[PDB]
Scaffold this active site. Sequence first.
Site, PDB file in Angstrom:
ATOM      1  N   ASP A  45       0.841  -1.194   0.000  1.00 57.28           N
ATOM      2  CA  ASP A  45       0.000   0.000   0.000  1.00 57.28           C
ATOM      3  C   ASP A  45       0.877   1.247   0.000  1.00 57.28           C
ATOM      4  O   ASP A  45       1.381   1.664   1.049  1.00 57.28           O
ATOM      5  CB  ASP A  45      -0.903  -0.023   1.221  1.00 57.28           C
ATOM      6  CG  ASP A  45      -1.793   1.185   1.306  1.00 57.28           C
ATOM      7  OD1 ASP A  45      -1.903   1.910   0.306  1.00 57.28           O
ATOM      8  OD2 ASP A  45      -2.404   1.395   2.371  1.00 57.28           O
TER       9      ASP A  45
ATOM     10  N   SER B 273      -0.670  15.545 -12.000  1.00 59.32           N
ATOM     11  CA  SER B 273      -0.924  15.196 -13.388  1.00 59.32           C
ATOM     12  C   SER B 273      -1.167  16.463 -14.199  1.00 59.32           C
ATOM     13  O   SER B 273      -1.700  17.454 -13.699  1.00 59.32           O
ATOM     14  CB  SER B 273      -2.139  14.275 -13.455  1.00 59.32           C
ATOM     15  OG  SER B 273      -2.536  14.007 -14.784  1.00 59.32           O
TER      16      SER B 273
END
Length: 330
Positions: free
Chosen positions: A35, A199
């Site tokens: 994770d 992004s």
Amino acid sequence: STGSATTTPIDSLDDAYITPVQIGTPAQTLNLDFDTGSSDLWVFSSETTASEVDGQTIYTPSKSTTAKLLSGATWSISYGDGSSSSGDVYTDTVSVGGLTVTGQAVESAKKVSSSFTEDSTIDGLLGLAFSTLNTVSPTQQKTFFDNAKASLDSPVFTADLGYHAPGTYNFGFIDTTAYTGSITYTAVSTKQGFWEWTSTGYAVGSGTFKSTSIDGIADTGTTLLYLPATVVSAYWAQVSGAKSSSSVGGYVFPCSATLPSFTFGVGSARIVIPGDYIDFGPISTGSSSCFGGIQSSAGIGINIFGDVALKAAFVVFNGATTPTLGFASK
């Protein structure tokens, strides 16, 4: 040193991925959920409340000659999905794919929430976010990667998750045969303890690319892609009959639909998520309403590039002094 381990989807939907981890001496192999959005290595154990164990493999520290109670240490964690777990702490030898760390903090669960009990395939979590998020008190502990870093050939790990198929976690090296083209690296902020990046935009299907900054985290422990409501609405508007369902908890779509791809930007590069990766199947057995793999982050507080996004890429988690992320197509 290096390590390399195969990671395997837990079910036919790729809801999560499990990777075998050797703990203790002799080794006890547990299948952990790696994770990158958390920083605790915790396991079902011989200390876990018996009614909260249902099919998981447990770590028994009393059977490990290298286990040592970390005196006074406790831990307690709550995840973004509302699940939680807590317990005490041992140090022990932990190996992943041939890479061994001695003295790793292994957080033994005394209590786990129902969603963990109900998932017999996941024996615990191995956190790969920054150690500043580790919950052990009163002495915070380091992640497996943090402990291994100095020994690795290069201070990196890579995630290569499969679509409906196994993939690979590598530590200490970048497998140049595992991706196409080049890896585009992008800046990371560690201020929240995550692999947080920005992004450069998105496209829906064959549509034009929208240049827009989307801050979010690279999180292998989250199944879906959670993005701003504007972006998510633009995606699902291209699927006839798709709608946000408050009763279901997100966007659903007719199972008869063909889903468009979704592209996200990494610098000037582009990662394409095929439409099929966005199908999470019937909302309940036999239903013709299917659950979408792109959902709004509006109620989370952060955008999350979960497995839906990451499995479309070869992802480099560069833990150099100034961390960065790399993405390549594959």
